[PDB]
Amino acid sequence: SMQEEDTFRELRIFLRNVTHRLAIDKRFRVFTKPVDPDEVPDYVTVIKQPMDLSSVISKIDLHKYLTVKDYLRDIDLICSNALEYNPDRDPGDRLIRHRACALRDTAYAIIKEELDEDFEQLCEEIQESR
Numbered sequence: 037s038m039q040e041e042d043t044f045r046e047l048r049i050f051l052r053n054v055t056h057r058l059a060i061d062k063r064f065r066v067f068t069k070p071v072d073p074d075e076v077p078d079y080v081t082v083i084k085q086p087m088d089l090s091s092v093i094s095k096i097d098l099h100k101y102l103t104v105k106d107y108l109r110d111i112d113l114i115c116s117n118a119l120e121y122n123p124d125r126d127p128g129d130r131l132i133r134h135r136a137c138a139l140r141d142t143a144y145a146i147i148k149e150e151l152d153e154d155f156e157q158l159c160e161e162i163q164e165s166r
């Protein structure tokens with residue numbers, strides 16, 4: 037309905053604002069764009085489902101997220117992918133892992149403080165009705 041599309045537009049505005057705040061954080065610069073194949077050709081090999089904050093923005097604008105749960109699944113994928121690609125005890129690996137967990141924790145904390153649970157419930161009930 038027209039009212040339901042108003043609800044999803046509000047969700048998109050909220051998700052763009054959260055993603056923008058993550059993308060401007062210097063800690064998260066490594067997650068802002070897709071991995072360049074000419075710089076790292078072996079990334080495409082190990083990581084089967086690449087995700088980054090620019091691609092999240094693209095999916096918001098393509099209306100792919102109907103709930104905050106669907107959005108947080110892609111945030112979680114950014115984090116899990118980084119841990120997968122960086123399993124060594126080496127400090128370069130440990131730094132990326134720390135930043136990836138901070139990205140995940142920051143997104144969840146913003147959502148916990150700023151998303152009304154009733155708004156998310158409405159989004160989920162509209163989604164389940166389709």
Ligand SMILES: CC(=O)c1nc(NC(=O)[C@H]2CNCCN2)sc1-c1ccc(C(=O)N2CCOCC2)cc1
Binds near residue numbers: 069
């Ligand atoms: C994103 C990610 O997970 C990742 N992990 C790395 N791991 C290392 O550098 C470790 C690997 N294990 C050995 C020590 N170094 S490097 C790395 C990584 C860092 C930068 C890019 C990159 O080209 N861009 C392009 C635009 O800006 C955003 C990121 C891709 C992968």
